[PDB]
Amino acid sequence: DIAALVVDNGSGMCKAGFAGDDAPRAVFPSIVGRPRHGQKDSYVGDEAQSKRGILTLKYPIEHGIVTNWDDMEKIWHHTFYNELRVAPEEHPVLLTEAPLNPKANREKMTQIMFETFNTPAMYVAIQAVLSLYASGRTTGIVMDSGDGVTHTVPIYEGYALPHAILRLDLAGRDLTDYLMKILTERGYSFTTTAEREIVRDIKEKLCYVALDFEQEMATAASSSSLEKSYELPDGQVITIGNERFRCPEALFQPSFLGMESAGIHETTFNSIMKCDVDIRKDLYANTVLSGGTTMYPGIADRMQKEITALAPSTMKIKIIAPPERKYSVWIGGSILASLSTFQQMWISKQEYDESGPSIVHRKCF
Amino acid sequence: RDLVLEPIVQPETIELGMPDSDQKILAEVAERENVIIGVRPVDEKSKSLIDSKLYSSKGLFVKAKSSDWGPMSGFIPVDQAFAKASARRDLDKFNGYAEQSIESGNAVSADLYLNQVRIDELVSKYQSLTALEFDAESGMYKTTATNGDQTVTFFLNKVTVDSKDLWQVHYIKDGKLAPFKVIGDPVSKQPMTADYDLLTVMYSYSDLGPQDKLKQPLTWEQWKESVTYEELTPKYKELYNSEVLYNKKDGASLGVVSDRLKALKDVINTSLGRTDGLEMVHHGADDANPYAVMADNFPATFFVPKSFFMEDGLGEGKGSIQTYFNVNEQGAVVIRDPQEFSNFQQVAINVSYRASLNDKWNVGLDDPLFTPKSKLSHDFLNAKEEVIKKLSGEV
Amino acid sequence: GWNAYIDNLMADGTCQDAAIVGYKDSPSVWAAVPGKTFVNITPAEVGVLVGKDRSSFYVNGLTLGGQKCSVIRDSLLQDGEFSMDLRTKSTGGAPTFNVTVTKTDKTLVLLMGKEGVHGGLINKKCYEMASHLRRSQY
Ligand SMILES: Nc1ncnc2c1ncn2[C@@H]1O[C@H](COP(=O)(O)OP(=O)(O)OP(=O)(O)O)[C@@H](O)[C@H]1O
Ligand SMILES: [Ca+2]
C-alpha cells in the first residue's frame, strides 16, 4: 500500500529502511563532510569516512539533539535518494527523536519534512518507546545508553513519563577517552585518533561485567588468567587485565573518573521512585536494556544483583537484555508505522498546512 | 534411530566430497568469528586435488564451468563438451568465456598429467574410471567412462613428465588422437582446480555495520580517489601503487562483494596456509549475483558456532524440527534441499542472525520461499504479533 | 447549554466521555455526559488540577469519577497550551483510556477516549473545540 520509510537518529549512527521489515536496509554514520576551504565534494556516509583524510567532518546531533539542521537536511537527502533511492514525497515517513527534544526542534523537523520533501504523512516516535515495543511490551522501564546520552525512562501504556525522566551526560566516548588514558598508564601509548578507534574496538571486543568487583580486582592483581592480548595492525600486542571490567564498572561508580554521580542502578531506582506507586511493580519487572553500550556481557545479572541489594527483599527484579538490542529500536519503528491503526496516527500534509507546526505538540506524544 | 542417521549419512557424501581437515579449520574460524559459513558441494576428485595442495583454483574471470566427470571434473576442460552439465547453449557460452580468458591471457590451455595414486582413487575409491588396456596403435591405454550419459573413449599415455610416470590424457578430435587439455594458470602455467564456492555468510545484529555490509562495484580511480594515502589497511598501499593487482583482487572479487567478506577472504586464505595468491574463495562468493542457479548449491554445507547448536528446544515455530538437521561430525553440517536450507536459515535468524538473500533461488524453484519481507522473517516479529495482541486488549 | 457541546464532541464515537466543568471560584460540573464518569467529578479534584502542588499526584495518582488516571503531560498552566494529558489506570489487564483536559478562559473541557483510541485524536478534538470557545471569549 505504502512502505513507509523508517529513519532512526542517534548521537553516532543512523539506521534507515522500509517499514514492515526485520532489520534496517541501510545504516551510516550521520556525519557530513565539507571541504577544507571544491565542486567535487561528497557530503555523506562511507564516502565521507573514506575521504575523511582530506575533508572536514561535522556532527549535526550532540547529546541526542539536532543542532545544525542545515546538514541534517543533507543527511536526509542521502538517506532518501542514495541509500534507499525512493522518492520520500511518495511515502509516509516515520521519524525518531531524542528524549526532551526542544519544542521548536520538533516543529523544525515537521517543517522540513512537510515543506521540503512533501511527505504525505509522518509520525515521531521516541527511541525508547520503540525499544519497549521491540519485545512484547507496552509498559516498563527502559535504560537507554547510547553514544551521547544515558536515559532511564519509565513508560506506562506506551507513554514515557517526562516528569520522572533522569538524564546522565556520560556514555561511550568518555569511556573511550578514559580507556586510552588508563591503557597508557599500564605501560602502553594510546593517544591518536587511530589509537582511539583501536581502543574502541578493544572495548567492544573484550569488556565484561564482574559480579564482585573488589574480588575480581583481587583476582586480576594475583594472576593473569583473565588477561587478554590484542594485536595492533602493526602487529604489536598489548595486554589488558582488570581494566576489562574496571571500564564498565564506571557505569555504576562514575567517581572512578572523579565524577560525583550515581550509578545507573541507583538512578534507575530513583527514576522508579518518581513514578506512580501503583505501576512500579510492572516497571520492576520490565527493565529493558538498549544501546550499543548495554551489550557488555554480564550487565543484566549484575544489575539484578545491585537492585536486589538495594530493593526491598520482597521486590521482584527482572533484567531483560534483548540480544540484538543495539538495533532493537529500528525494529520497533518498522512495527509502529506498519499498522492499520496507524492510519489515524499519520500526520497529514493537510493538517500542517491548515493548523501549522504546533499541532505536533498537541498530537505527537 | 535411523531417522537422524540418514540425515547423518547424507552429510557423509559431502565428507567424501570435502576434506574433514578443512572442516576442522573452518569450524575453528566459525568459533573464532561468530558467523555462519556456507559452502557449495565439491566432489571427490576435488578431494584429490585439494589433498595435492598443488595448484591454483577456479576464479571469476575463468567463468568456465566446474567439469562434470572423472579426471576432467578434477579440472575444467579446454572444451566444455567434456564438462557436460547444463545444456549445449550454456556450454557454448562457457566456451565463449574460455576463448575470452584465452584472449585476455587470464587463462592458458594446459595438458593433463595423472599419477597412479590418482588412478587408483578414480577406479577403486571413485569407481569412475574404467580399466585401462594398452593399444599399440595409440601407443596408449584405452579407457572409457560415462562423462555425460554417453560413455566416451579416451587414450592415456604413460609418459615421463617432471621425471614422474604421469598419465597424459588424450581424446579423439576428427578421428585423430590429440592431447586432452584443461585451463592452465597464466602465471604458473599449471592447471586451475575448482575453487570453493560459498553460500551465505551470516552475522549477528551485534555486528550489523554498514562499513562492513555494503556491496560496492567500482574499480581503480574510484577506489584510489576514495581513500587518502594513509586511511590505510596495509595491502591497500599496493593498491595505490598498482592498478593490475587492484584489478585482480578487487575486480575478480568485486562480484557484489561486501567489504567484510573482502577482509574475511584474506583471513581465510591466510588461515588455510596457502600462498602466492593461492586461495579457495577468490570468487568473492556471495550468491547474490544474478546467476546463483539453485541446483548447483546442493547438497550444501555449513560451519556454525559451537554455541549455536545447544541454544533452545527444537520446534522453533511454524518452522519446526524434531531431528536436529543433517548434522555431520567434525563439527560440520550439511543440507540436502532448499526447504532444509530455508528452515536452517529461519532458525539461525532466530539466533538473531541476519540472512543474505537473492531472488534467483526462488526463481530457480517457482514456489514462494525466499522473500525476507514476508517469508524469511524471524519469530520476534511473531512476538510483535503478540504485541498487537496486547494492543488488541488495548484496541 | 454546555450539554450541546458535550453532545457535539461525542458524536463521532471516538470518545466515551466528555464534560465541561467550571474551575473558577468554586468548581462545579457545568455539563457532562449522563450515565458516565465525569458527571460525578468533584470540585476538589479540579482544585488539584489548578493547584500549586504539581508533584504529589505523580506519586499518589488521582481518581476521576473513581477511574484512576496518571498525568502524562502537563501544559495546563502555559499560555497558548492550556492542556493536560492523562491516561486511565486499570487492574488485571482491564483496558485503559486516554484523557485530555483543556483550559479555556472560563471552563475545563474533559474527554475520555474509548478502548485503543489514541490520545492524539482526543487531544486534537478537545484543543480545536477549546480554541473555538476561546475565540468565542470562553
Ligand atoms: N560491542 C560493543 N560493546 C560496547 N559498546 C558498543 C559496541 N558496539 C558499539 N558500542 C557503542 O554503542 C554506541 C552506539 O549505539 P547507538 O547507535 O544505539 O547510540 P546512539 O543512538 O547513536 O546514541 P544516542 O542514543 O545517545 O543518540 C556507541 O557508544 C558505541 O561505542
Ligand atoms: Ca539515539
Numbering used by the authors:
A (entry chain B): 4 to 40, 48 to 375
B (entry chain A): 19 to 413
C (entry chain P): 2 to 139
Sentences copied from the publication:
Bacterial human pathogens secrete initially inactive nucleotidyl cyclases that become potent enzymes by binding to actin inside eukaryotic host cells. However, once delivered into the target eukaryotic cell, the effectors bind to actin, resulting in more than 10,000-fold increase in nucleotidyl cyclase activity. Our structural data together with molecular dynamics simulations and enzymatic assays reveal that specific interactions between two independent regions of the toxins with F-, or G-actin lead to stabilization of the catalytic center of the toxins and high enzymatic activity. Thus, the enzyme is activated by an allosteric activation-by-stabilization mechanism.
In contrast to PaExoY, which is activated by F-actin, its homologs from Vibrio nigripulchritudo (VnExoY)12 and the human pathogen Vibrio vulnificus (VvExoY) are activated by G-actin, indicating a high level of specificity of ExoYs for their activator. We, therefore, decided to add the actin-binding protein profilin to the complex, which does not interfere with the activation of VvExoY. Since most of G-actin in cells is captured by profilin, this represents well the situation in vivo. The addition of profilin improved anisotropy and allowed us to determine the structure of the VvExoY-G-actin-profilin complex at 3.9 Å resolution, which we used to build a complete model of the complex. The structure of VvExoY is very similar to PaExoY. One concerns the N-terminal helix which is rotated by 90° in the VvExoY structure. First, the C-terminal helix of the anchor is extended by 6 residues in the case of VvExoY. Interestingly, this does not increase the interface with G-actin in comparison to the PaExoY-F-actin complex since the C-terminus of VvExoY protrudes away from actin. The second difference in the ABD is more prominent, as the sensor of VvExoY is enlarged by 9 residues in comparison to PaExoY and rotated by ~90° allowing the ABD not only to establish contacts with subdomain I but also with subdomain II of G-actin. Since subdomain II is involved in intersubunit contacts in F-actin and parts of it are not accessible, the sensor of VvExoY would impair the binding to F-actin, explaining the preference of this toxin for G-actin.
